[PDB]
Each structure stands twice: as structure tokens, then as C-alpha cells.
Design a protein around this ligand. Sequence first.
Ligand SMILES: C[S@@+](CC[C@H](N)C(=O)[O-])C[C@H]1O[C@@H](n2cnc3c(N)ncnc32)[C@H](O)[C@@H]1O
Ligand SMILES: C[S@@+](CC[C@H](N)C(=O)[O-])C[C@H]1O[C@@H](n2cnc3c(N)ncnc32)[C@H](O)[C@@H]1O
Ligand SMILES: C[S@@+](CC[C@H](N)C(=O)[O-])C[C@H]1O[C@@H](n2cnc3c(N)ncnc32)[C@H](O)[C@@H]1O
Ligand SMILES: C[S@@+](CC[C@H](N)C(=O)[O-])C[C@H]1O[C@@H](n2cnc3c(N)ncnc32)[C@H](O)[C@@H]1O
Lengths: 292, 292, 292, 292
Amino acid sequence: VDSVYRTRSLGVAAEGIPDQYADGEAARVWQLYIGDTRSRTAEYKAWLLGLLRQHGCHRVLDVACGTGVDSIMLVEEGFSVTSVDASDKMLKYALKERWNRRKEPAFDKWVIEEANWLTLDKDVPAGDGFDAVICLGNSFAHLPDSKGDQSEHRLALKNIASMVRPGGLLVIDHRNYDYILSTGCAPPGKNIYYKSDLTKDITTSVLTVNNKAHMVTLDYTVQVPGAGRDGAPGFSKFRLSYYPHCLASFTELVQEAFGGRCQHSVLGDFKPYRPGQAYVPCYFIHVLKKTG
Amino acid sequence: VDSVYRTRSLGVAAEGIPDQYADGEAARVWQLYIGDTRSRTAEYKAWLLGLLRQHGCHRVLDVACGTGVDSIMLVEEGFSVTSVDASDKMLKYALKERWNRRKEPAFDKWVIEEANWLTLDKDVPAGDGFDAVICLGNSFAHLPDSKGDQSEHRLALKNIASMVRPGGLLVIDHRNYDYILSTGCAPPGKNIYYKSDLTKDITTSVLTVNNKAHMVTLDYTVQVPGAGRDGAPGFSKFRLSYYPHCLASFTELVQEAFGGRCQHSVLGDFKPYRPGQAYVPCYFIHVLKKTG
Amino acid sequence: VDSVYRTRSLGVAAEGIPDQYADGEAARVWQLYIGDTRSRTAEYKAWLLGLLRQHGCHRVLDVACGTGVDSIMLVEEGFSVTSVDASDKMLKYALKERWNRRKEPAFDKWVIEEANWLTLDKDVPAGDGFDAVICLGNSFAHLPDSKGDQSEHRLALKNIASMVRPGGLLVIDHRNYDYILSTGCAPPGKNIYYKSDLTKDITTSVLTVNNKAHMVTLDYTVQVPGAGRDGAPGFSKFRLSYYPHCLASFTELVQEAFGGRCQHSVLGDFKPYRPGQAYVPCYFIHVLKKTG
Amino acid sequence: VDSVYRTRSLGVAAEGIPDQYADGEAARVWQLYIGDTRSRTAEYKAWLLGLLRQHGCHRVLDVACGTGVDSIMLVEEGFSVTSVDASDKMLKYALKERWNRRKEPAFDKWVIEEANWLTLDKDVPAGDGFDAVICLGNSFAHLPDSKGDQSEHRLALKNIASMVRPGGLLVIDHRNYDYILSTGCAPPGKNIYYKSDLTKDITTSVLTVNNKAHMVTLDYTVQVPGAGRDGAPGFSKFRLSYYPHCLASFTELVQEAFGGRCQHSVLGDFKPYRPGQAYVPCYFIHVLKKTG
Ligand SMILES: C[S@@+](CC[C@H](N)C(=O)[O-])C[C@H]1O[C@@H](n2cnc3c(N)ncnc32)[C@H](O)[C@@H]1O
Ligand SMILES: C[S@@+](CC[C@H](N)C(=O)[O-])C[C@H]1O[C@@H](n2cnc3c(N)ncnc32)[C@H](O)[C@@H]1O
Ligand SMILES: C[S@@+](CC[C@H](N)C(=O)[O-])C[C@H]1O[C@@H](n2cnc3c(N)ncnc32)[C@H](O)[C@@H]1O
Ligand SMILES: C[S@@+](CC[C@H](N)C(=O)[O-])C[C@H]1O[C@@H](n2cnc3c(N)ncnc32)[C@H](O)[C@@H]1O
């Protein structure tokens, strides 16, 4: 019988040595990519701040915290923000920012915590509920459908909806999977939230099981600038996958998390979406108010 | 022809979702094991405090920080401490403690940083050097010997040596491998630093390649106290490996890192050691005062 | 740092012991599946015999031999047959049949050899060429496209073309992928060559990379008739992948292998085919007579 | 959760493509190595034939058939030989020899079959039992001890013993693990059965679990002659593992398979073994006669 013997179990750590896959090529380019989410768009800052001001929002939950980018902006702008994420490699970066800016009182008062959408209700005390829960940049699509029925999608989305105060707002988005599913090409860098300073090439694979689109996998080949001989760049690659959320399924899923007690509007890039307009958006943003 | 597709590359993270090996069975008992073995022994506290004080040490580098237990003791007793480690999954727990106690002025002053013994000089500013460097808990032995000659142990020990000020101390220990390599059994829980609440069994595997002990592997079977049926214990395993440093070679390796310019003593468990003494230590502590 | 020890290298065998993946769960249902699907259809026998006879074929190369079912039919009906395949695990079953029937003079004359389509010219002496080459059973589609351009299909088809004598035939088929790629469902057991006793379900996954169907994967759930409790069926899965050859491209690929010097016809199931005919084949059989 | 998607299950085959790991570097050198077992020693041929002649042996079972080397020699010498092995990669070579030599009547009458030592009794009809069962060249040591107690060793050895006719012979061997266990070096090419024409370097690893030697792993680096630039050789590597059978354990195990109803003699290289002679043998051969 063939035995394989690992030096240590997958998932364990040890004091003087880097964790399991922390310095592979894939993790190295990936770090350049997550650091390139820096340069937020004027449009983005303008839309989101205006939405939240117009509604009088003050406590806000960022449920896809990441490196802290969206959250750092709300802290700076005076909101009282709680930020959670299920990933520790990403939470490390937010945490580091809060420690650096500790002495600025608004950053001493920023709550970053671990939480999973599947167990949110128990990970995060709702309190009287928040004024706006945000889940933006196609964070949500990372979540696969393991069970084949979309039960896990329904559960994460209900819990997210459970953190909205009555009268409050959920702002959640997804990339345009309707376009991607029909050209087979997720085109690089047409991005409405941060301007990318890296050049990347994307290969898109779409897996369809029986007749249903089940996953979109993107291979990102990143030109890394200083890494050849006489100043030339190198190229390296990493991969990430997603659930291809179509606008109509998603609209059903999201209004179902509210039990139908919501108003619901869907924007196109930051502008309205009239189904059958010419302009094919890169991202659909849904803004739901709990009306009940 | 065969090919193997993965969702995402090994090493990358994403906002929705737990990181790659994080909620495996082995990472859950392992998390038990680092938590319910971080309650220090009075002997150790008194030993380590009296030594540092005895030599008039005030700035200390902990170069194998882990969850911070060693540094926390020292941060509390009013030393200026900087703690590094290479493992993010472990530093996570020291960082979190610093935050929760960020209101006590000593804890506001604790530096915790990423660094690796191999590049330690490029990662930590010694300046004129620290008063003591500590690498306790049998952490040096985590570093494998990947090129068959011990060039990586040499490099690491030299970079650790360099952080010590002239007249400063290096305190670095290792398990008694001499014994382990004769009995083939690293016995559980005879621990001099921390008091273990958890019941465990250990299987020890020793790998020998063209007659040199090259690695010792411990498989931990942790009894987990409420996981079974009628309050009965539930059980899980994890594994971790060590380089088996024998006292005589390690003694040579560590002198050679100060270029011979050092005074060296080896403690028995905390007691002094002489060959063939009746008492068999579980740990050899080496104390090296740097002459120049 | 992590390392992974194996007992023995991947690909090596040893006298004591079963070969590496041989008694897995998947190799056991798979063995069921190749056995209890090798009982040929009267339609096929009559179709294939009449064609060969009709053109006065006598030496035949089976270039996708497998367990030998196609060759055995022909060896019995008095043709001079040489059978090659690249898979040892499959050739094993043809070899064994040859031995058991080594006393019948036709079977003493059957050649069964290892060869690969890619190197086929270097592996099989055509001499002046064979009368017919056969590659039936949807075997050509096993060859993946690993360089993204179909250079390996081209090479393989050209080397198969070269074994055909001038005035000889190439008979090569493929499943109807056109249909599969629109319905997303390769339906079970509508098979024209062999009569299946076994009950199976098939999940079909289609992989598409920057808008080109690149692979179809079938997961077979085989109902195994006595494996459960009270004679109840026990169940196991295995998986196998295909390159989805569409009729029009395959038609171009196969002409191009004879340099255009060929006459080409495509049969519907065994019946002739015309576009938009009401009858939808499960298999397209291509018959190519080489002109020069 | 990370999915990994294979093209096909481990262990399945498919008509136009090589089986899973058949053309890796490891399998390529390994084939040069198994083909280098060619050049049987004069000493070997002389001893074995003389033993078997002196006992009047005629039906003989080779239970570690391999490529067929020992068996081909007994066929040629007139014995009535049945040869079994559990490995198909190796049985393929024997089988091919029998087909080549088919017309020589003694090779038409050679029975090669698949069998496992663990299920031997049911794989091979004993008949009235054989005159000599042979298991030579350290075939037996390939068999690991999965259960930790040597139950599997006891079972394979009992079944092997069950194929010996009363008055018949078992000739079975093992390398000198007592020497290997004490120098840590299985030295290359001191071989008493075939002269090796390949130059190989061996690295020996010994794994000890708790105090018991559990496995000896050999990395064979083979100088392959024509594989560099101007005629120079290349070097490639494969690995194989074994149970370190000590002479005294083995002597117990083997006489226990007979229930103690045996005579037992143990040879040194082909010559007698007096425990405490100077000459340290490379191989111990045991010859047991069933006396009962
Ligand atoms: C790092 S996240 C933004 C995080 C955000 N600041 C937050 O609050 O969650 C970037 C997202 O943009 C995605 N995206 C969709 N199509 C893209 C494309 N063609 N190129 C780059 N990113 C694209 C990535 O898949 C990823 O999910
Ligand atoms: C929680 S860690 C100690 C961390 C410490 N703060 C530092 O300086 O890195 C527990 C340590 O005890 C070690 N240990 C070694 N042998 C052991 C044994 N037989 N029983 C229990 N713990 C053992 C483990 O290898 C591990 O490195
Ligand atoms: C036993 S093999 C045929 C071997 C044949 N003697 C030859 O020429 O290679 C069975 C073949 O039927 C194919 N097949 C394709 N689609 C199928 C389906 N839907 N149901 C059953 N078999 C299917 C399998 O892929 C496999 O290659
Ligand atoms: C191919 S087998 C011989 C097969 C034999 N003709 C039969 O009847 O089974 C070769 C054996 O010699 C072994 N052996 C032991 N020590 C060796 C060494 N230092 N170098 C080479 N082979 C050695 C291999 O491990 C292997 O098990």
C-alpha cells in the first residue's frame, strides 16, 4: 500500500518557519494583486458616500472586510464601522493598518473580527442591527455551491440580511456573469472600484455540470515589473474561482433573504439599470432597504 | 494524459471564505494544543527573570515569538521587548493579545514583527544589538536540514548571534535528543516551561539517512474532553517534525556562530549540567554571553 | 518547511505487491464497466464486416485495441489483424484472450503490440500499408489537447493516415459532441456498438476556456448488483474525460491528415448522414478511402 | 472548500493513451533497473539447480515471479513451473517471453498467473502441493507491515507454506537487515544472484517508530549511459521500500508458518551460516523442508 509521510499536518504551524504555502510563486503574485486594490475610484467614493449620507447611515458592517480598503475609508469619514472576514491572510493587513493608526481615535474605535457568512448571526452581535451592511467587489461570488442546490448561498445571504436594522440598507454586488457566460471572456481590468496599475492577462474557464454553470475560474497572469534582466518584467500566475451569479437568480435570492420585505434597486456601473439598455455593466450593485 | 484543476492556487486567500487548511481536523486539535499549553511554570518565570536581571538586561529580542507567551511575561515585568516570528498563523495570537491589552502602557510599547532566522539581519534593526536574545521552547529544532549539510542551521544561528550586543546574552535551548535517539521515545508532557492540562499520547518516528539521524517526527493524539457521546472524550491527531540536535554538535554549532568570541554554559533543566550526572534533563538550555 | 516522503516512486512496481492504483474502488467498478460492456451488437458486426469485405480488405490495423473486442471479431472472421494500444492495463485483456485461444490457428497469428498514435510510425511497420485502419468506439476523443492548438490531434491523425495503403480505408468515429455541448448531457447507454447490461448514471461536465469547449468529463455511477445488504445493489463511481470533437472541425482535421487526397463519407449511426436530418446520431463514423 | 478535479480516476485506463504514471522519469529508470536483472550468477544457477536436483524436485511454484528470470531458467531446465506475482507491470515481461518462445513446448506448458501472498491459498490450486516453492531475491521484504503487528507477514508466510507438498521445500530469502540496521548503509551492487552492469548510488533511510525499525527506503540514483551531450551518461532516481527482516525474527516467523513441523537451514551467501563467523553475508537464504 503506498504511504505518503508529511513533515507536518496540513494546517499546523510552528515557531521559526513560514506557514505552509506562504512563499510559493502563486502567493507572491497574489500579494501584489491584493495590494493593487489601492487606488479607489472617484466614482466609487462619490457613490458610496453619497448613498450612505442620504440615508443617515452611521453604524456600518463591512462583511467582506479583506485588507480593509473599504472599511478604512468609512472610518476616515467618521462612520462607526465593524469589519469582519473569514480569511486570516487578508485580515492580517487590516489589523496592521489599525495598529499603525492606533493613535488616531477613530482607528482605535474600529472593530475588526473574524466571522463567516454561514455562521454570521452567532459570530457578530447584531445589537439593534446596523444601518448599512456592505458586501462589495464580488466578494460574495467567491462562495461556492458545494451542496449543488444553492442552500449555502441562501443561508449566508439570510444571515447577512439579518444584520440590517429595519429601515437599514444592504449594498451587495456581483460581476456581470450574464456577459461572462455568453463571450467566455472575463476581460482584464475594466474596473469601476480601484484603478489597477498592474497589467494582467485573464483566461476564463467556465465549468457547466449537466446544463448548469457551476463555476468561473480565472487564471491571472501578472506582469511583475522589476523581475527580469535589464529592468524587464517577469510574469507569474495565480488562480481564483467563483459562482456565476446571474442577475435574475441573484435578484430572487437576495429578495428571498429579506422574505420579500425589502425595496430593491439594481445599478449598472454606478448608474441605473434598465434591462435592455445598450451599456453592459461590469458589475451589478443591488441596494436593498429592509421595509419591515 | 492526466491533469489536475484546483479551485484556487495553493497559498491564495479570498474575502468570502476560510483560508486553505484552516478548519481541518488537524488544525483544530492543534489550536487546542497551542492554547492549553501556554500556562507557564513558576520555575521558568523565576529562572528566566533572575538571569536577565542578574546581567542587567533591559532590551530583549524574542526571536521565536509564537503566540507571545514568553514575550508577554517580559513585557509585563517592564522589559523593552521586540518579538519576531516567521509564522503568521502563530503571530496572530500575540497580535490579538497586544490589542486587547493596548491600554496598559507597556503593551502599547511591545513590538511584534514578522522575521525569519535566515534573513533576520535584513528584517530586524539591531542597531547596536539587543541585551538578550531568547529562542526558548525548543523552537530552533523546527528548522529542517534541507541541504544535508547543516548550512541553514549555521546561517540562522549566525544571524541570531549578530543581534546580540557585545556583553549581551543568547539564551537558546533544545530538547534532549541524545536520549530520544537512544530510547526512540520522546515521552509526553515532562515539560519544564509550561503546565499542560491536556492528555496526549506521542508516537516518535526517527528518520536516519546513510547513518545520520535526520529528523524526529511526533504524532500527537490529543484526547479532546467533550467531543464524544455521554460527555466522553473525542480524539484527534496532528503531526509535527524536529531536527534532532545532539548536545555536542549543537554546542559546537552555537559557538561557531559567535566566531568563538563567547562564553558558553549549558543548563540541565534549570540546574547546571555536567556529563554523566545522574539527572537526565528534558531540555538543554544554552546561555552564551558574547565577548566581542 | 514541508517535505513529502512516499514508499516508492510513482510508476514503479515490485514483486511482493499490487501495483499502485490497482485495487482502488474506482479501478474495481471500472473493471466491471470494461467487462460488462464488451458484448457486441449484430448491427455493428454486420456493418463493419460488410464494409471491409465490400472493399476487399484483408490486412487490418486496429489502432485502438483496448481489450481486443474489435480485433477478436475480425481475427475470428479470418482477417490478418494487428492490434496496438498505448494502455498496458487494457492490452492485458487482449493478450490474455490470445493466450487462451492460442490453439485456434487464427488466434496464433494475431499480433498485439504496444504503440501510441503520436509515435505510431516509429512503432508499427506499415510496409506498404494496411488495407483498413480502424479506431472505433470513440477512442480518438481520449487524447486531450494539451498545448491549446490541436497540434497533438493533427500529429496523431497524420500518423494514423500514414498506415493506410493507397486505396485502403480509415474508419474512425466520435461521439456526437455537437449535441452533448448543447444539451450538456451525454445520456447513458444509447450505444450502437455494444449491448450494456449494467445500469449507470452519468454527470457530464463541460470545461470551456476563453470560449472553446475544451473537455467533457463523465462521472459514471455504476450500480453494482450484489454489493449491499439483502442482495441490494452497492454503488461506485469513476471518471473519465474526452475531447469534444464537433463534426465540422473533425471533418476538417481528418481530411487534412490525408493531405486532401482522400474520399470521405460520414455515417449517421450506421446509416448515411445528411445535415438537418431528423435522426440524431449518437456516433458519427467517418470512412475515408485514401486516394494517393 | 478547495476542490481538486482529476481528468480521470486513479487506476482507470483508456484506449489511445499511456496509463497514469508509465513514462515518468522514475518509471523510465526503474525499467532499466528491472532489465538489468539479466546476468545470473554461476553460483546462483549452480546452487539452486543442485538443491532442487538433489531433492528430486519437479513441480515448482515461483511465488515472486517478476519479469520471469528465475522461472525462465527452471522451464529451460525441464521443471514444470507455475509462476505467480501480484504485480501486472512485472508480469507483462514474463508473459511476453512465454509468447515469444511459445513454439518451444516447455514454454507452452509454463503457467503464469496473478496471485497475492495474502490470498494465495485461493488464488493458486495447491493440487497435491508443489515440490519446491521459491521466493528469492528479497521479494518478500517488499511487503510492509501495515497493521504494526506483523499479522500480514504471518498470513502471507502461512499461505506460502501451504503450497509445499509434505516432504517438499520452501526456499525463501531476505537481505541482511542486521548489517544494514547497524552501518545505515545498504552498499550498492554486492549482489550474489545477477551481476549488475549499471552503476547506481544508494542512499538508505531507516525509519524507526517508537523503538522498532519499521522500514528501509532506498533511493537508487542510476547512471544512464547515453543520455548527456558527447556520449556522457545521465543520472536519474527512483525509490523503493522494505520491511527490515532480522535473521532471528524471520527464522521464528518462517518456522511458525510450518507450525514447527519443518527442518530449517540458513545459508550465508550461497554457503553455510555459522552465527559468529567472520563473513557477513549480503543475503540469508532459508531452506525449509516440510517434515509433516
Ligand atoms: C479584492 S476584491 C475587492 C475587495 C473590496 N474592497 C471589499 O470590500 O470586499 C477584487 C474582486 O474583483 C474581482 N473581478 C471580477 N472580474 C474581474 C476582472 N476581470 N479582473 C479583475 N478583478 C475582477 C476579483 O475576482 C475579486 O473578487
Ligand atoms: C506552545 S509551544 C512553546 C512556544 C514558546 N513560547 C516559544 O518560545 O516558541 C510547545 C512546545 O513544546 C514542545 N514539546 C517538545 N517535546 C514535547 C513533549 N514531549 N511534550 C510536550 N510538548 C513538547 C513542542 O514541540 C512545542 O514546540
Ligand atoms: C469498452 S469501451 C469501447 C472499446 C472499443 N473496443 C475500442 O475500439 O476502443 C466503451 C466506450 O464507450 C464509450 N461511451 C461514450 N459515451 C458513452 C455513454 N453515454 N454510455 C456508454 N458508453 C459510452 C466510452 O467512452 C468508452 O470509450
Ligand atoms: C528484481 S529483485 C530479484 C527478482 C528475482 N529474480 C525473483 O525471483 O523474485 C531485486 C531485489 O534486490 C534488492 N536488493 C537488496 N539490497 C540491494 C542493493 N544494495 N542493491 C540492489 N539490489 C538490492 C532489491 O531491493 C530487490 O528487492
